[PDB]
Design an enzyme around this catalytic site. Structure first.
Site, PDB file in Angstrom:
ATOM      1  N   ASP A  27      28.705  41.299  82.425  1.00  0.00           N
ATOM      2  CA  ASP A  27      29.554  40.909  83.548  1.00  0.00           C
ATOM      3  C   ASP A  27      30.749  40.112  83.035  1.00  0.00           C
ATOM      4  O   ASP A  27      31.875  40.274  83.505  1.00  0.00           O
ATOM      5  CB  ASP A  27      28.719  40.068  84.512  1.00  0.00           C
ATOM      6  CG  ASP A  27      27.321  40.639  84.718  1.00  0.00           C
ATOM      7  OD1 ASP A  27      26.553  40.711  83.729  1.00  0.00           O
ATOM      8  OD2 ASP A  27      26.992  41.019  85.863  1.00  0.00           O
ATOM      9  N   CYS A  85      37.843  52.779  83.785  1.00  0.00           N
ATOM     10  CA  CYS A  85      37.114  51.555  84.079  1.00  0.00           C
ATOM     11  C   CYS A  85      37.969  50.968  85.177  1.00  0.00           C
ATOM     12  O   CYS A  85      38.969  51.585  85.535  1.00  0.00           O
ATOM     13  CB  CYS A  85      37.047  50.647  82.852  1.00  0.00           C
ATOM     14  SG  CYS A  85      38.596  50.433  81.931  1.00  0.00           S
ATOM     15  N   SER A  86      37.607  49.806  85.713  1.00  0.00           N
ATOM     16  CA  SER A  86      38.394  49.233  86.797  1.00  0.00           C
ATOM     17  C   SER A  86      39.871  49.542  86.604  1.00  0.00           C
ATOM     18  O   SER A  86      40.478  50.242  87.419  1.00  0.00           O
ATOM     19  CB  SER A  86      38.192  47.723  86.884  1.00  0.00           C
ATOM     20  OG  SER A  86      38.854  47.205  88.031  1.00  0.00           O
ATOM     21  N   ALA A  87      40.440  49.049  85.507  1.00  0.00           N
ATOM     22  CA  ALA A  87      41.849  49.280  85.221  1.00  0.00           C
ATOM     23  C   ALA A  87      42.076  50.442  84.246  1.00  0.00           C
ATOM     24  O   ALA A  87      43.178  50.985  84.174  1.00  0.00           O
ATOM     25  CB  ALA A  87      42.497  47.992  84.681  1.00  0.00           C
ATOM     26  N   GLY A  88      41.044  50.829  83.506  1.00  0.00           N
ATOM     27  CA  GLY A  88      41.206  51.917  82.556  1.00  0.00           C
ATOM     28  C   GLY A  88      42.139  51.564  81.402  1.00  0.00           C
ATOM     29  O   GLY A  88      43.064  52.322  81.092  1.00  0.00           O
ATOM     30  N   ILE A  89      41.904  50.412  80.770  1.00  0.00           N
ATOM     31  CA  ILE A  89      42.722  49.960  79.639  1.00  0.00           C
ATOM     32  C   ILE A  89      41.941  48.982  78.748  1.00  0.00           C
ATOM     33  O   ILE A  89      42.056  49.014  77.530  1.00  0.00           O
ATOM     34  CB  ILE A  89      44.041  49.256  80.110  1.00  0.00           C
ATOM     35  CG1 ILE A  89      43.708  48.010  80.933  1.00  0.00           C
ATOM     36  CG2 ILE A  89      44.904  50.213  80.944  1.00  0.00           C
ATOM     37  CD1 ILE A  89      44.934  47.191  81.329  1.00  0.00           C
ATOM     38  N   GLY A  90      41.145  48.117  79.366  1.00  0.00           N
ATOM     39  CA  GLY A  90      40.367  47.148  78.611  1.00  0.00           C
ATOM     40  C   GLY A  90      39.213  47.787  77.855  1.00  0.00           C
ATOM     41  O   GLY A  90      39.344  48.061  76.650  1.00  0.00           O
ATOM     42  N   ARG A  91      38.089  48.001  78.555  1.00  0.00           N
ATOM     43  CA  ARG A  91      36.888  48.620  77.984  1.00  0.00           C
ATOM     44  C   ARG A  91      37.188  50.041  77.523  1.00  0.00           C
ATOM     45  O   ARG A  91      36.735  50.459  76.455  1.00  0.00           O
ATOM     46  CB  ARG A  91      35.749  48.640  79.014  1.00  0.00           C
ATOM     47  CG  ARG A  91      35.303  47.267  79.477  1.00  0.00           C
ATOM     48  CD  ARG A  91      34.082  47.318  80.408  1.00  0.00           C
ATOM     49  NE  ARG A  91      33.918  46.054  81.122  1.00  0.00           N
ATOM     50  CZ  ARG A  91      33.004  45.822  82.061  1.00  0.00           C
ATOM     51  NH1 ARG A  91      32.147  46.773  82.412  1.00  0.00           N
ATOM     52  NH2 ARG A  91      32.959  44.635  82.664  1.00  0.00           N
ATOM     53  N   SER A  92      37.947  50.773  78.338  1.00  0.00           N
ATOM     54  CA  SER A  92      38.335  52.149  78.012  1.00  0.00           C
ATOM     55  C   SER A  92      39.075  52.142  76.681  1.00  0.00           C
ATOM     56  O   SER A  92      38.905  53.046  75.858  1.00  0.00           O
ATOM     57  CB  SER A  92      39.263  52.711  79.096  1.00  0.00           C
ATOM     58  OG  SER A  92      38.631  52.801  80.362  1.00  0.00           O
ATOM     59  N   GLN A 149      42.367  44.412  76.771  1.00  0.00           N
ATOM     60  CA  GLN A 149      42.840  43.294  77.588  1.00  0.00           C
ATOM     61  C   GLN A 149      42.596  41.860  77.123  1.00  0.00           C
ATOM     62  O   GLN A 149      43.229  40.939  77.634  1.00  0.00           O
ATOM     63  CB  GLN A 149      42.259  43.448  78.991  1.00  0.00           C
ATOM     64  CG  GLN A 149      42.656  44.719  79.701  1.00  0.00           C
ATOM     65  CD  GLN A 149      41.843  44.940  80.957  1.00  0.00           C
ATOM     66  OE1 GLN A 149      40.617  45.089  80.900  1.00  0.00           O
ATOM     67  NE2 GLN A 149      42.514  44.959  82.101  1.00  0.00           N
TER      68      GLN A 149
END
EC number: 3.1.3.48
Length: 282
Positions: free
Chosen positions: A180, A214-221, A261
């Site tokens: 989380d 992903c939520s924004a599609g930049i961090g985890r992605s 991120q």
């Protein structure tokens, strides 16, 4: 190579410093289309937009917009379509893209709900007998089978082009154990998740680009794509120790802003690669 450079950064506690330098060096390009008032309801965050030069276009004359970008790594001969978590009103678009781009699989690194809040729409059917129909893009999606595992869950879906009745098989790869807050204590699960995605051939050249989000599609992605490419480069290059992850992230950022991120994520990306190279080499 980098492993040492990793500890070096660690002891000096300069992870935030390096990461910031990357934010400074990151490319800057126009997102005019994204900014258009017409497409406001097609974006999650106002600070996460796709560059116009590398945006993904929908094969429809009315509006071809969708917050998704094509990241093409020339040297690695690998391409990923990074996109935002689908919105209630962009699920039809998301699958129309998966269709038009001939993607073999979708990669998800978040849960529909996190921190008690909504991260993205429930864009895929949870029950075999209750399929979903995306009226606006005339597509039908059906859950064929599900394999729930400890850290990840792979789904076999059927996407059908109601317009031509043509059907295609999509592999939904869902990493469901990303914490989380912060990042994973160990890249083991993530690395294994990645190899599974590879094994399906969803990353192979014979298929259209794999869709990652992903939520924004930049961090985890970002972690996903960056890690894959770097490992891939260490196998191809005559000198594996030459792979500069920072250099690779910057190249990816010419295609989509924000990839990775936080400093911790950047740290984790190194960790993943280092440990991933270990597993592969030898």
């Amino acid at each position: 190579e980098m492993e040492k450079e990793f500890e070096q950064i660690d002891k000096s506690g300069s992870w935030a410093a390096i990461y910031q330098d990357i934010r400074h060096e990151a490319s800057d390009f126009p997102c005019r289309v994204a900014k258009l008032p017409k497409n406001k309801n097609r974006n999650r965050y106002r600070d996460v937009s796709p560059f116009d030069h590398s945006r993904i276009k929908l094969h429809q004359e009315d509006n071809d917009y969708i917050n998704a970008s094509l990241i093409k790594m020339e040297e690695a001969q690998r391409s990923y379509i990074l996109t935002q978590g689908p919105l209630p009103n962009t699920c039809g678009h998301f699958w129309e893209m998966v269709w038009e781009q001939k993607s073999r699989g979708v990669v998800m690194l978040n849960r529909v709900m996190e921190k008690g809040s909504l991260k993205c729409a429930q864009y895929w059917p949870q029950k075999e007998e209750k399929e979903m129909i995306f009226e606006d893009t005339n597509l039908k999606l059906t859950l064929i089978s599900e394999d729930i595992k400890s850290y990840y869950t792979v789904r076999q879906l059927e996407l059908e082009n109601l317009t031509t009745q043509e059907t295609r098989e999509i592999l939904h790869f869902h990493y469901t154990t990303w914490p989380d807050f912060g990042v994973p204590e160990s890249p083991a699960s993530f690395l294994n998740f990645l190899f599974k995605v590879r094994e399906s051939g969803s990353l192979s050249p014979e298929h259209g680009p794999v869709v990652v989000h992903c939520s924004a599609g930049i961090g985890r992605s970002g972690t996903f794509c960056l890690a894959d490419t770097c490992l891939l480069l260490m196998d191809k290059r005559k000198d594996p120790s030459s792979v500069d992850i920072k250099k690779v992230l910057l190249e990816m950022r010419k295609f989509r802003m924000g990839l990775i991120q936080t400093a911790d994520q950047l740290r984790f990306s190194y960790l993943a690669v280092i440990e991933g190279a270990k597993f592969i080499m030898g």
